[PDB]
């Protein structure tokens, strides 16, 4: 009764998205603004190392706990960390060839923000920016997995 929560995107009912308290709630919006993949003003190398540090450190775990070397003591950590570094390596290769295939042609035309003003295009979406991002990912991921081993070896009540 003269109360509604769910709205179409910025007016405009003819773009295939509609706004919900899942997508456009304020705390969710500010949260996903503050993630490194949406910042647009920083150099892509640094985003690469942040994202890599995060993903390597999380990728180390399951190989440690559930890998085929998980019951033999004191070497269950080594094989897991090494395998995780291998996975990060392959992810870096995937990023490189994606850069070779995606941005290989002309970019798009135009972009505006939601509360309309003409914002410029993100420099991550050019060939150079993406390649730099991939290098940052490799560095960050390997550093993260190495830190996972380090963190295992010196940590109060790890088990």
């Amino acid at each position: 009764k003269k109360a509604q929560v769910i709205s179409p995107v910025n007016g405009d009912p003819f773009v295939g998205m509609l706004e919900t308290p899942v997508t456009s709630a304020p705390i969710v919006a500010t949260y996903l603004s503050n993630l490194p993949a949406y910042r647009t003003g920083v150099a892509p190398v640094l985003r690469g190392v942040e994202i890599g540090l995060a993903h390597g450190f999380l990728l180390a775990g399951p190989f440690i706990k559930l890998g085929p070397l998980r019951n033999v003591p004191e070497t269950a950590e080594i094989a897991g960390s090494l395998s995780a570094a291998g996975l990060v390596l392959i992810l870096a290769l995937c990023l490189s060839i994606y850069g070779s295939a995606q941005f290989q042609s002309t970019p798009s035309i135009g972009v505006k923000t939601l509360s309309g003003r003409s914002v410029a295009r993100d420099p991550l979406f050019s060939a150079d920016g993406w390649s730099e991002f991939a290098a940052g990912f490799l560095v960050g991921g390997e550093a993260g997995v190495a830190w996972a081993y380090v963190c295992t070896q010196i940590l109060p009540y790890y088990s």
Binding site: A3, V5, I6, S7, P8, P21, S24, A25
Partner: protein, 93 residues
């Protein structure tokens, strides 16, 4: 139509919805029946919460007569708050 922009207040916070929620549900949740021998559905697993808070890192047993208290307690606590929030009769009833 439905709207043109998402309102950044959709949960209209009335401050005495939650306090009446759990305060007006727990003050009658600890009465005392013949059913438990003189105990409540808020003090009988206060014993439990503190009881397996004593031995801390051991997660409590997977048949221990108090998961029932947790589940049947929240099954009513959430319900009374979700019917309290529809005590926004500001335009409807």
């Amino acid at each position: 139509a439905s709207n043109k922009s998402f309102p950044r207040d959709w949960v209209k916070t009335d401050p005495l919805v939650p306090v009446l929620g759990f305060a007006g549900w727990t003050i009658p949740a600890n009465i005392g029946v013949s059913a438990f021998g003189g105990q409540s559905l808020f003090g009988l697993f206060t014993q439990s919460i503190g009881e397996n808070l004593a031995h801390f890192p051991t997660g409590p047993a997977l048949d221990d007569k108090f998961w029932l208290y947790l589940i049947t307690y929240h099954l009513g606590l959430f319900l009374t708050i979700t019917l309290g929030q529809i005590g926004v009769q500001g335009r409807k009833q």
